[PDB]
Design a protein around this ligand. Structure first.
Ligand code: CL
Lengths: 305, 305
C-alpha cells in the first residue's frame, strides 16, 4: 500500500550527463550518440544576458572554444550548431551508454522526472509536472541548466525537458530537446510573466481516486453533480475545465474502485467549497494535482521499467 | 531556488537489483560481489507465514532450490546461509557493477532513498525517513520485498534498509543489510504494533530554515523562548524532545540565515499553538519532518554524488 511521489529510475540518463563549458560559464549536457545537447546560454558572458544576440556570439565561437568532458574523459568537439535555444555539439565519439531514446514535447499537465545535475554530475531525482502555464516548480540552483526531464516506458527514455532559467515567480522554465521553450519564455535574464496558473483537475481526481484505494475515504459523499456544475465550481476556484476525455481517461481507475467519475467530482466539489477541515488525504492537507491518472495506475499496479 | 523532496541518483543500486525465487514466492535481491542478499521469507509457503520455523524450513532447502537471475542471466547459487532475518546466497560470479559500498544501521530520524523494485526490475525512487518508531511511510506492493534503501556520499553507496513487510497501520518495516529488524518487528504475518510515533523536531526546524532561504518568511516572529519551554510545548504535541546536540547540528544553517535556533523554535512553538491559518510553507499546509539538516544544506549547496 501507500502512495508516494515516485520518480523513474535515473541510471539510464545518468550515463548521458556530461559537462559543457564555454568561457567562464559551465553548465550540464546530455550525450546521446555523437551529439551533446546543452543550453545555448553557455556562450553568453556576464554582460550579454539581458538581450544576447546569440547568432553573433556563436559566430565568434568555434569548436575548440567548447570544452565537453564526460566525467574525466574529454570529448573532441568536431561540430557546432544552434537549434532554436540549444546548442548541438557533434563529437568524435558515441556514448557507450546511450539509452534507447526519443525526444518528446509533452502536453501541459503531463508529468516527468528531473535528474538535477551540477557540473555534469547527477545530484538527485524527483518528479515534477508541466503546469498549465508551462512552468515547473522544482529545485534548481545556479549550474542546474542542462538537467533534463524525462519519462521511461518499458525500455525507452523519452526525454522531454531541459532546465534553462528561474522565473521571478520562483518557478522554473525550460525547453524540449529541440530547443523550443515550453511557454512564452525566452532565454534572456529579463522579468518574464508566468501566466495565471490553473489546477490540473484530472490529476486531483486521480489522486483522490488513489486515496480511496489506500484507505482515505472520508471525502467520499452521498451527493452527485453534473459535468457543467462542477465546471462552474471549477472556474470559481481557477481549476482546469473538465472534458469528457478526462472522464474516459479516469475510467480504468473508476472501475477498479467502483466509484463513478462524476460522483468523485461531487466529493471534489465539496472539498473545494468546504475546504479540508484540518483533515489529511493521503498525507497532505492540500489537494495534489501532480499525479496523472497513469501515475496512479502505475503505482497501484507495480509497473517495472 | 526551490525545495523539493529529492532522492539520490539510483543508477549505482540499479545494477545490483536481481531476482530471487524459492518455490512460488518471488522477491528481489541485492547482488554485491559474490553474495545475493534477499529477505528470508522467500522460503515460506502460503501456510508458513503466521509462525514460520525458518531454521527447519531452510534445512529442507538446498542451493539448487534458490533461483537467482540478474535480469536474463541466471546465477549458479553455490552457498546458502541465514543471518538473522535475511538469506545470504553465495554465487559463482561477482556483479561487474558492484558499487563501492558499506552496510549501515541508520539512527531513527535519518533519511534514505528507496529504489522500489518488483521482480528484480527497478520501478522508481523516492526519499523516505526512518520514523522515531522505526517505521517508514513509503509505497510498497506485494513483491517489493528486497527493495533496499540507501544513501550515497561522494562515491560510496551506504545501504541501510531492506523492505520486509507492511504493518497493519499501513506503514512499513524492514531490516538493515545484516538482517536485524528496525524496531520491534519480526517477519511473520501477525498483527504487530507500531509505537506511538513522534515528530522529528530537528527536521521540522530544518525545513522551516529552508523556507526562509527560499522566500517563505511569514512564520518568523518577534517572540523567543527557552529550550525547555519549547520542549513543554513539544511534549504536548508529541514532538521529539530537543537537545543541545540538535542546536549544534542546526548551527551551520542558523548562520547562513542569521536566525538563532531558539528564535526559530519560537516561530515553531507558535505554529503548533495557533496552527497554519490556511497558509502554506514551502508548498505544504502541514509541517514537514522528513528533511534532516543535511538534506537542507545539501539542496541549498548543490552537492553532487
Ligand atoms: Cl500538505
Amino acid at each position: 500500500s501507500g502512495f508516494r511521489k515516485m520518480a523513474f529510475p535515473s541510471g539510464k540518463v545518468e550515463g548521458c550527463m556530461v559537462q559543457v563549458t564555454c568561457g567562464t560559464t559551465t553548465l550540464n549536457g546530455l550525450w546521446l550518440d555523437d551529439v551533446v545537447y546543452c543550453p545555448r546560454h553557455v556562450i553568453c558572458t556576464s554582460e550579454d544576458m539581458l538581450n544576447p544576440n546569440y547568432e553573433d556570439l556563436l559566430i565568434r565561437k568555434s569548436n575548440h572554444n567548447f570544452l565537453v568532458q564526460a566525467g574525466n574523459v574529454q570529448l573532441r568537439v568536431i561540430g557546432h550548431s544552434m537549434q532554436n535555444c540549444v546548442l548541438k555539439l557533434k563529437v568524435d565519439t558515441a556514448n557507450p551508454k546511450t539509452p534507447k531514446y526519443k525526444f518528446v514535447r509533452i502536453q501541459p499537465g503531463q508529468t516527468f522526472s528531473v535528474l538535477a545535475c551540477y557540473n555534469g554530475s547527477p545530484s538527485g531525482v524527483y518528479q515534477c509536472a508541466m503546469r498549465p502555464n508551462f512552468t515547473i516548480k522544482g529545485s534548481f540552483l545556479n549550474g542546474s541548466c542542462g538537467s533534463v526531464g524525462f519519462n521511461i516506458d518499458y525500455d525507452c527514455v523519452s526525454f522531454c525537458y531541459m532546465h534553462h532559467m528561474e522565473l521571478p515567480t520562483g518557478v522554473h522554465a525550460g525547453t524540449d530537446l529541440e530547443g523550443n521553450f515550453y511557454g512564452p519564455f525566452v532565454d534572456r535574464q529579463t522579468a518574464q510573466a508566468a501566466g495565471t496558473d490553473t489546477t490540473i483537475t484530472v490529476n486531483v481526481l486521480a489522486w483522490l481516486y488513489a486515496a480511496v484505494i489506500n484507505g482515505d475515504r472520508w471525502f467520499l459523499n452521498r451527493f452527485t453533480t453534473t459535468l457543467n456544475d462542477f465546471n462552474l465550481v471549477a472556474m470559481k476556484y481557477n481549476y482546469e475545465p473538465l472534458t469528457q476525455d478526462h472522464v474516459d481517461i479516469l475510467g480504468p481507475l473508476s472501475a477498479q474502485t467502483g466509484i463513478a467519475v462524476l460522483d468523485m467530482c461531487a466529493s471534489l466539489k465539496e472539498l473545494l467549497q468546504n475546504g479540508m477541515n484540518g483533515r489529511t488525504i493521503l498525507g497532505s492537507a492540500l489537494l495534489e494535482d501532480e499525479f496523472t491518472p497513469f501515475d496512479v495506475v502505475r503505482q497501484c499496479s507495480g509497473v517495472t521499467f
